Design a protein around this ligand. Structure first.
Ligand SMILES: Nc1ncnc2c1ncn2[C@@H]1O[C@H](COP(=O)(O)OP(=O)(O)OP(O)(O)=S)[C@@H](O)[C@H]1O
Ligand SMILES: Nc1ncnc2c1ncn2[C@@H]1O[C@H](COP(=O)(O)OP(=O)(O)OP(O)(O)=S)[C@@H](O)[C@H]1O
Ligand SMILES: Nc1ncnc2c1ncn2[C@@H]1O[C@H](COP(=O)(O)OP(=O)(O)OP(O)(O)=S)[C@@H](O)[C@H]1O
Ligand SMILES: [Mg+2]
Ligand SMILES: [Mg+2]
Lengths: 455, 268, 114, 114
């Protein structure tokens, strides 16, 4: 038995070599064993699905929906024939190109949302220094935020500036970091960053990102807690776990320098003291579930935003003081929309109830109590397989249905020959079950096909 | 780019754009939704809100704009005046709105024109020379000519709801494409009675009742004292608005029980 | 009457200037006329749809389907409310991201087709 | 009054009035109340109280799925039932919660219900 094909074949090849070595010399070198185990681990990690698509596949298996792996771009196909759907990671085959392209454009998304009456931060664009001061009275004063037009991983973006010189230096940094020399300036909004997941126009999960911090309730300072948190089993690196290890970086050191305290400074009364202010899970922050505390009007507004942009699965960033009140009384704003979000933080909140995002994705792809199955008729025997297959196909064709059938002569889809050759093995059955026009499948299952690769 | 197929230069041109439009809109259908435009001088906002409340009884999402703000269903979508063509684009672009109710003010028409091409229903309540000299409107005839934009911009299968007791509004009966429906607080209006004899679709207030005349048949809606906005039938301005609101939705095929339920529970 | 908003406003502004100049001096310089015409042509070319989207808009107008121009990415919206569709040039709002990305990949497309 | 029922709910069995007819023991009362639970079609559901030993004993001889409800969130039978399958209902922290296996669906805060 194997779990990975290449790993299983490698282990089968290595077992006989190990046995030959141990019967020839009486023992096997430990270095060769370590080499074999590390090679097996490498093969296991090589053919592995992402943390999101595997979670979706687990729900698909539980609901009894067949799934195959296409060879193009790590795409997965659920169902058979005319009832099939495709997903890559979180993008489905019904996600529009226009919606994704609009979401990737920050400035166009902001204009579209503003035209629809959605509360968005008030900002301005500037390309010369003389304009900067002007924008300052347009946004309404201080504090302000300086960001580039185009950037990745937050290059050249400040968070909170309250005077002239810091604004000027941040503008210079952004201008030299931006690819187009131009810089946007927004009003700064105070609040807690929230991540809302919208599936099929319905809010599924809401999480609040609390920035990486430590609390001295145990009469202990930062110097011990930084490594005490890092020793918790929940923490991990990679793209699978929400909680990353607290990276004490030079930038992080400077940020905690701006905190006003020291490494050994004990927190007073046992109060939270932060290490960064970006409120991101990569830094080492945490997530708090708030799905039950959201106001119905906010749910309606976010559902409307997801449809205005035109995304079936969307991740919206909100900045508000309290999600339990409408976004009008509190100066709440919509910051950005992401087209292919990762629901990895909503299934392991670590401070609340986990939500079944994969269940919602499957409920969107296959609405009712239905799977992606089509009638399959498998003919086997010794003598009359081909004639029976052709007669079955001809009888079914009288009903207005497209029939795909495979015999020894070839593989047919309706009235036109689709493939030539023998085509009675499992490798020719995938062509029939993957065609987006086949409604009924008729398969001649030969003995050699079962012996060679199974059904 | 399909533009190599629309001018082959050695064969027959193909209508690719026709195929694209047949894919986007399959049948003999367009992307239109019912639009009800309310204009007049005095009772625009109350009539707009009453129309929206009556339509909400049917399981439909109604987007409407008044002077208070722009609403989409039950939640406020935008604040301010919002009675011009710039606030009508927010309603007609929402991917959840099924019926649109628009209060079309005079300043919006003067400044930027009308916010759409054709409307399913056009209601004209009254024309009264109360504020004059603004812009280049200094005569009640020009005010009527300006308010006539809503009535004249009605599609041939639409309806124009008009007040039979206003000589200027009733004069808009001509130069109207589509049917005309009169409403009057006086049951003995000769123009309305003559209109019902050949055709119909009028609304009157006959004997403490709000009645619809579909020709020679009378359909009584309510007793006008169970309607809270009339204050037990004491305010005559409110009954005129209620008649227009009921007649507008009756021409669209709304059932009588929905109209009655919506009218009985509307609160100012 | 105008066909382009900015061009119409520019022509309206320039007409009174031309009339004032001709009533003040008896004639208008030809170089200024050429400058005005080339500016009008530039405004005409600036706000113009592509050869594909204009052909689609012509059919939409003939069928009586309302159309507006969104301000985001040269997208055009047909219809109202819940019956609306969007196109950019030839991409519609129902064209999938996965299909476009697969088509842009020659080697994966060849494998899938094979 | 019927042959089969889609949903059969059994709330509790308590020996309060006895001696009527041929019912003289709480075991006979439970056997009598078990008619509703046992007359459930194979695709139906039997809703049972997990805190009552007599009602929970009706878990057997039932055609169709069984769903437990309990006012104590730490009922061992209910928790063991949710681990393989699910469909339970509990009152955990001032909340009315549905357990569909390893997932918790909170309905209401139990103080907003009059
Ligand atoms: N007006 C604002 N008020 C408060 N916080 C803001 C404001 N604008 C931006 N932010 C914060 O700054 C972040 C900027 O978004 P980013 O996702 O970092 O954009 P980005 O430059 O594309 O980086 P990536 O690649 O998307 S992670 C937001 O997620 C908020 O946490
Ligand atoms: N039920 C049957 N019992 C015995 N012989 C049969 C039967 N049906 C068909 N045959 C004979 O078997 C021959 C070959 O059968 P086919 O119709 O080709 O089915 P087939 O098994 O798919 O053929 P193969 O496997 O490629 S040799 C026919 O020409 C008949 O002579
Ligand atoms: N049919 C009517 N005839 C005369 N006066 C009316 C009528 N309907 C309402 N009014 C009066 O006009 C007042 C204002 O009407 P509204 O309900 O605000 O409609 P409105 O025209 O949208 O308001 P405006 O334009 O913003 S002043 C009401 O409070 C009534 O006193
Ligand atoms: Mg054969
Ligand atoms: Mg008003």
């Amino acid at each position: 038995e194997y779990e990975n094909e290449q790993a299983g074949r490698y282990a089968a090849r290595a077992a006989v070599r190990l046995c030959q070595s141990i019967v020839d010399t009486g023992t096997y070198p430990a270095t060769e064993l370590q080499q074999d185990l590390e090679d097996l681990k490498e093969l296991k990690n090589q053919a592995s699905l992402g943390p999101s698509t595997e979670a979706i596949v687990k729900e698909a298996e539980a609901r009894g929906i067949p799934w195959t792996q296409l060879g193009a771009r790590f795409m997965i196909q659920f169902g058979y024939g005319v009832n099939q759907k495709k997903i890559q990671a979180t993008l489905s085959n019904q996600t529009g190109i226009l919606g994704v392209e609009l979401a990737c454009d920050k400035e166009g998304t902001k204009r579209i949302l503003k035209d629809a009456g959605v509360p968005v931060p008030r900002g301005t664009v500037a390309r010369y220094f003389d304009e900067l001061q002007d924008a300052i009275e347009y946004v309404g004063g201080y504090p302000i935020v300086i960001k580039p037009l185009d950037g990745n991983h937050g290059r050249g973006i400040t968070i909170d500036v309250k005077n002239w010189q810091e604004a000027e230096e941040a503008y210079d940094l952004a201008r030299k970091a931006s690819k187009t020399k131009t810089v946007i300036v927004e009003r700064y909004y105070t609040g807690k960053d929230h991540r809302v997941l919208v599936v099929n126009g319905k809010v599924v999960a809401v999480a609040e990102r609390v920035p990486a911090h430590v609390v001295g309730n145990g009469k202990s300072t930062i110097a011990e807690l930084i490594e005490e948190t890092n020793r918790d089993p929940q923490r991990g690196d990679g793209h699978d776990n929400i909680l990353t290890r607290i990276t004490v970086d030079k930038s992080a050191l400077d940020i905690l320098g701006k905190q006003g305290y020291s490494i050994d400074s004990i927190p007073l009364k046992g109060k939270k003291c932060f290490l960064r202010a970006t409120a991101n899970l990569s830094t080492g922050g945490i997530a708090v579930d708030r799905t039950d505390e959201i106001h119905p009007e906010n749910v309606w507004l976010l559902s409307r935003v997801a449809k205005i942009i035109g995304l079936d699965i969307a991740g919206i960033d909100v900045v508000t003081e309290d999600i339990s009140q409408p976004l009008r009384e509190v100066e709440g704003v919509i910051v950005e929309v992401n087209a292919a979000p990762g629901f990895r933080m909503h299934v392991a909140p670590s401070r609340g109830l986990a939500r079944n995002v994969a269940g919602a994705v499957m409920d969107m792809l296959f609405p009712g109590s239905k799977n992606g199955r089509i009638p399959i008729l498998s003919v086997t025997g010794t003598n009359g397989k081909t004639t029976t297959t052709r007669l079955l196909a001809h009888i079914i064709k009288q009903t207005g249905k497209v029939v795909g059938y495979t015999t020894t002569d070839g593989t047919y889809i309706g009235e036109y020959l689709a493939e030539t050759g023998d085509n009675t093995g499992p490798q020719s059955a995938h062509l029939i079950l993957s065609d987006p026009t086949v409604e009924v499948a008729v398969l001649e299952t030969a003995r050699g096909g079962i012996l060679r690769s199974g059904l | 780019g399909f533009r190599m197929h629309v001018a082959p230069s050695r064969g027959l041109a193909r209508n690719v754009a026709g195929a694209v439009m047949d894919m986007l809109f399959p049948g003999s259908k367009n992307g239109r939704i019912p639009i009800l435009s309310v204009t007049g001088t005095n009772g625009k906002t109350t009539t707009t809100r009453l129309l929206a409340h009556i339509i909400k009884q049917t399981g439909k999402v109604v987007g409407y704009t008044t002077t208070d703000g722009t609403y989409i269903g039950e939640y406020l979508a935008e604040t301010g005046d919002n009675t011009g063509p710039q606030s009508a684009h927010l309603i007609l672009s929402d991917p959840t709105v099924e019926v649109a109710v628009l209060e079309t003010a005079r300043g919006g028409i003067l400044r930027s024109g009308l916010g759409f091409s054709s409307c399913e229903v056009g209601i004209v309540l009254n024309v009264t020379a109360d504020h004059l000299g603004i812009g280049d409107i200094d005569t009640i005839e020009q005010l009527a000519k300006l308010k006539s934009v809503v009535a004249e911009s009605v599609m041939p299968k639409g309806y124009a709801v008009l007040n039979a007791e206003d000589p200027l509004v009733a004069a808009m009966a001509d130069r109207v494409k589509g049917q005309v429906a009169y409403f009057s607080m006086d049951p003995n209006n000769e123009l309305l009675l003559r209109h019902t004899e050949a055709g119909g679709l009028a609304a009157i207030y006959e004997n403490g009742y709000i009645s619809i005349l579909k020709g020679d048949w009378t359909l009584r809606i309510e007793k006008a004292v169970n309607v809270p906005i009339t204050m037990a039938g004491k305010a005559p301005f409110m009954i005129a608005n209620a008649l227009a609101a009921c007649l507008a939705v009756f021409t669209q095929g709304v059932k009588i029980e929905h109209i009655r339920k919506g009218l009985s529970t509307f609160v100012a």
